[PDB]
Amino acid sequence: AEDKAAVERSKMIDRNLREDGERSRRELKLLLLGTGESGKSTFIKQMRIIHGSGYSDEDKRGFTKLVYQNIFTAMQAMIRAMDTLKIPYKYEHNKAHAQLVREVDVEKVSAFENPYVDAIKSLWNDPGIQECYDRRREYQLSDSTKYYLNDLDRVADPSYLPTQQDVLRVRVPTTGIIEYPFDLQSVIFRMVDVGGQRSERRKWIHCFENVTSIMFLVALSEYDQVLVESDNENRMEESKALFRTIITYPWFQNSSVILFLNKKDLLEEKIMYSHLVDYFPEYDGPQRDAQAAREFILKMFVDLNPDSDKIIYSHFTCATDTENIRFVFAAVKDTILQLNLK
Amino acid sequence: AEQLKNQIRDARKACADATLSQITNNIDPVGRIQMRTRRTLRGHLAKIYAMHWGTDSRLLVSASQDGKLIIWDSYTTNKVHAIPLRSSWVMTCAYAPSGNYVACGGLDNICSIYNLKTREGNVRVSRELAGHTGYLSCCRFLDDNQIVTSSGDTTCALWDIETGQQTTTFTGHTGDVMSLSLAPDTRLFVSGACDASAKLWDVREGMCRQTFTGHESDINAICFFPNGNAFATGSDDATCRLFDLRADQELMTYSHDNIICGITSVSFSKSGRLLLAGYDDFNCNVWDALKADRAGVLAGHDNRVSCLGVTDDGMAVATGSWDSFLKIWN
């Protein structure tokens, strides 16, 4: 007899297959969603810190390149804004430093060389550019630009090693899907991220039919951002639309919803000057109050849910805060286990 | 500058003298098509998105959101290979004509080639084909070292596996590219996208030869007619449609009242006379290519049919569903 070569093999494949559908049902897919620059990536990063393999010296170096990258992007946007808000430079020499930095190959940055340090430091000193930074609420610019740019010092030195904080802030250009697996001792979690998808959602959204959980994210600091090029669109009114559409999907019925209200530390910092009312006429409460504003924002967002039966479990978060998340997430953990154990 | 666009509309109109309907009319229609399930491929644990036949018309690959890609013995039933994919978010598979490699991609934007019959432990990740900024729509080899790919980021790309490099990029689409199909000779491919219009491309030269409008919505499926001078398109607008390259225009629309669900897949029959399509309403449909009649149906799935596959010897059909099942029809 000469047969059953891969017939006998097919037996042992169903063996592995059943063991792997067995393990994978215990995986809890937690889909991160929310607009641009609203905290998802950072969250994932925090998970690797509290519940995962950390960022050891080696792991860190792999970011050095990205640190540089951000800076240029940060500066690059800043430069555009100048010619959009019609703000000129205080110092003449800097206009050359702009052309210099304009032509910078968005992505090709190996090291952070001397001619580029000055170019950028020079500009960071220009009272036009700082004024542009002071009006970042119009156009879109990363929220930790100041962080790095007030540190050009260390970032540009030869023997430079980044640290957790830098790590927690670099824009890490996402090819497409970001999935991260980890576990609370007995249970395994699998975070999901699709922010860096340069395509239409309506062709792949259904790939997420009844996942364990949805974690939706709003930036609180977002309330007063408008984007003049993008025709004065309120950046948080924008996020309200994503969420409304996200919250009406049939795909997500069985999926528990969590609303992270992120960039809170940035909220009450700024709620003292910018006023919530003259951006959302309906706002009724006091001024110069974080708590009143959080509660309000959390309401317009929850209001977008059509039907009693589906409870949203929100939290207030600072995604840069390692101990905040460490403590916020335990709550989520429970309200997921307690809620999906039946 | 743009009424030059309103010039091919005179060209294709002067080319129109008779319809494909008018001509295929006094010819007798199709005999009778009622295929029954010849096999049920059972092994995936979540919904399957793509499948592709081997050139031997017997072995085939699947691609399921279960993070497992599977090679099947279609005649028998036996699983030959199971691929533990790094990303369970896959959206297509490929079968090398040689059957030495197998490609697959998805929301990762990495076209993963897999070295099949080997002397390695089991089956290894061979190449990383990275360069796309959106989900991997579909893919099919030209040989063991070149593959055309189409993706969400509105572009299709021809690669060189050996070196893993972007050989030539085929840009021209507005909406996402959903589909692709090589011509018989692999001299030039057709690709359907969410611009509601497919494109005929020249493989080596790069540039887009002909653009084809028609559908009032998203194409998800495209298909080269056996001889290589026509193609089928499967769209959300619920119509299948026919285009001749040499005529440079639509010849047939496989509409139908009372059906309104989208179409995920299309694949012709050896002769070209049958258009097998796969639908949202869990039903596959068998179309008279020439007459525009609805011959039969492959009703047999519980969820929508995500992909089709017709054999090279045209004696069998695979259908792939979101119900984690494949069925062979005869």
Binding site: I44, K45, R48, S53, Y55, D59, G62, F63, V172, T174, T175, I177, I178, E179, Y180, P181 | R86, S87, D108
Partner: peptide, 8 residues
Amino acid sequence: LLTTXXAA
């Protein structure tokens, strides 16, 4: 998945 991250 990246780029480490995930793992990586």
